[PDB]
């Protein structure tokens, strides 16, 4: 039992995985076994979702999070997001589940049977955390892998049947992307957009050409970065800025994953392009807009002149102006005027919502969609009672958008905490005081008093 | 082919469960590593075969 | 007969813990069925 | 639904997604067995 108690390792059982820091073979096993757990869940969860799936109800009425990801890639769906074939969902689930066995086998082998350190076995596979060149090499390999993955998305969208396009002319449908956006002014433009209202940084991406083009760039950037990191060693200024240890590296990645988690939370909460509402349900903004649309339609059918109808406050009951003058829906949904969606855009003119289009061009499909979205707003209880907090039991619904945003907030948050924990510890360990202050060399005792 | 399928699939499940217990126990066991190692090889190739059999036969029952 | 240690403590803990999970699970099942289910 | 040929395995499929959680719990059983050393 090498390094598998507190007396030999210096780490208690509850920090037992820290016993692995310098045991590259066993740590490889932990990592590969873990990847197995991730892949297992993707596989198992998909098959559970498929088993539980009723094709003629919306996905979002059924507690699905994975089938919607598969559908968004253009698999299993047709016009409007209707399910035309569940077999692609079965395939994805099965292949992930099978693959997990392989990862679990490798993981278990390296963890309990293989060489506990890799360095005397292989100069290629072994590593010292403190060897800057080998760390950038392995980083480089993994960048190449990630770039190939981004190009897989590109290949799916351009060469293997397309992606689900909620914006497709004449109604959402799977569409092949033939003209991905390559112009770096557009692609990198998203990156410099404000994250505030009406701008929304990268989360505002609203067409598949930009999405695909973005992955072309990312894939090429990542492959190039990987080659770069294989072929170079960190420069002097980077050597002086960072802590070079396994725990430090963990810390940096925790920081990064935290940031990505908060971004993902915002993506699924606001974005209805890469998270089509057909699969994920309406966004919060979308459903609030849909309510105003619903009652505008109803009251106008009854004879209301909706442009001229003054509400209790003096603002338009149905229609008002945004702070820059655009015609928008009124009531509290004034906050959501930056919302855009395919059911609403046909009513939009150069100056915003167009009164003549409103009076004459609203189609029954738009009424249906607005009613659907108003009544599947992402509000609901922890026990999955759909609606406002005061609603009675009846409807079993919590939007996938709420599940995905809340879970990823929680996870991003604790990952920030882990970043702080491990970055602070990495620092202290590198400097030599992570176990406490030396009684005979207490630094404050050598400093002048403050007063 | 349905009889072949359904059996091949239950055999895959049963073998999987055997491997799930047996592989870790074998790896962490002091004696009989020689015999164990052969069996894990056997079980592993047989598991892979059965996956391919179910995969093929899938199409003749669906 | 009553010698301490004959049943290892890790087994007692595991079985007891599994028992807790089962009974608590039954209680969550019951939130969805019969009285209190809203149905 | 799963394809009809797999329907026999429905109860098994209902259980699989929970398995990763059991690995966390297993770490505890294991540590109890070695006395949390």
């Amino acid at each position: 039992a090498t390094n598998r108690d507190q007396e030999s390792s210096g780490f208690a059982w509850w920090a037992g995985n820290a016993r692995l820091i310098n045991l590259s073979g066993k740590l490889l096993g932990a990592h590969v076994a873990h990847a197995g757990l991730i892949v297992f869940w993707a596989g198992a969860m998909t098959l559970f979702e498929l088993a539980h799936f009723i094709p003629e109800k919306p996905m979002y009425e059924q507690g699905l999070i994975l089938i919607p990801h598969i559908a968004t890639l253009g698999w299993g769906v047709g016009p409007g997001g209707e399910v035309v074939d569940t077999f692609p969902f079965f395939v994805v689930g099965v292949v992930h589940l099978i693959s997990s066995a392989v990862l679990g086998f490798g993981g278990v082998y390296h963890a309990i049977r293989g060489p506990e350190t890799l360095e005397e076995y292989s100069s290629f596979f072994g590593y010292d955390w403190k060897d800057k060149n080998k760390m950038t090499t392995i980083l480089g390999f993994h960048l190449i892998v990630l770039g190939i993955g981004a190009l897989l998305l590109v290949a799916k969208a351009m060469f293997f049947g397309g992606l689900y396009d909620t914006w497709a002319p004449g109604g959402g449908d799977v569409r092949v992307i033939t003209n991905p956006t390559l112009d770096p002014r557009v692609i990198f433009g998203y990156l410099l957009k404000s994250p505030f209202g009406g701008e929304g940084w990268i989360v505002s991406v609203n067409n598949l050409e930009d999405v695909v083009g973005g992955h072309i760039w990312i894939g090429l950037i990542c492959i190039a970065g990987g080659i770069w990191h294989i072929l170079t060693t960190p420069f002097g200024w980077a050597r002086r800025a960072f802590i070079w240890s396994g725990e430090a590296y963990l810390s940096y990645s925790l920081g990064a994953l935290s940031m990505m988690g908060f971004i993902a939370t915002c993506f699924v909460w606001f974005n209805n392009t890469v998270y089509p509402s057909e699969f994920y349900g309406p966004t919060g903004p979308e459903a609030s807009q849909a309510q105003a649309m619903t009652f505008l339609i109803r009251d106008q059918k009854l004879g209301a002149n909706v442009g001229s109808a003054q509400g209790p406050t003096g603002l338009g009951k149905y229609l008002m102006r945004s702070p820059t003058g655009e015609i928008i829906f009124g009531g509290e949904t004034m906050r959501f005027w930056d919302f855009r969606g395919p059911w609403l855009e046909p009513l939009r003119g150069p100056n915003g919502l167009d009164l003549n289009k409103i009076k004459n061009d609203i189609q029954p499909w738009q009424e249906r969609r607005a009613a659907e979205y108003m009544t599947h707003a992402p509000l609901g209880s922890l026990n999955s009672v759909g609606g406002v907090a005061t609603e009675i039991n009846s409807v079993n619904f919590v939007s996938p958008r709420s599940w995905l945003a809340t879970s990823h907030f929680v996870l991003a948050f604790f990952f920030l905490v882990g970043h702080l924990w491990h970055a602070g510890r990495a620092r202290a360990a590198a400097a030599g005081f992570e176990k406490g202050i030396d009684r005979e060399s207490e630094p404050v005792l050598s400093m002048p008093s403050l007063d | 082919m349905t009889i072949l399928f359904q059996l091949a699939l239950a055999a895959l499940v049963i073998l999987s469960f055997v491997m799930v217990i047996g592989v870790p126990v074998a790896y962490a066991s002091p004696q009989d590593w020689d015999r164990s190692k052969q069996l894990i090889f056997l079980g592993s190739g047989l598991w892979i075969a059965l996956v391919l059999v179910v995969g093929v036969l899938n199409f003749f029952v669906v | 007969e009553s010698e301490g240690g004959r049943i290892p403590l890790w087994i007692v803990a595991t079985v007891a813990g599994m028992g807790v999970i089962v009974i608590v699970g039954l209680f969550f099942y019951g939130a969805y069925a019969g009285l209190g289910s809203s149905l | 639904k799963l394809p009809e040929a797999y329907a026999i395995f429905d109860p098994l499929v209902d259980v699989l997604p929970v398995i990763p959680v059991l690995f966390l719990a297993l770490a505890f059983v294991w540590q109890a067995a070695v006395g949390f050393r």
């Binding site: - | 217990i21 790896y27 066991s29 | - | 109860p11 059991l22 294991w30 067995a33």
Partner: peptide, 29 residues
Amino acid sequence: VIAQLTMIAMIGIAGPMIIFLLAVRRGNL
């Protein structure tokens, strides 16, 4: 009812069985 509870019972015991089998064998726990 019975199928799901029987499954989770065999899957559930597998982990503790592995530890138990190894403890009995004085394996490398």
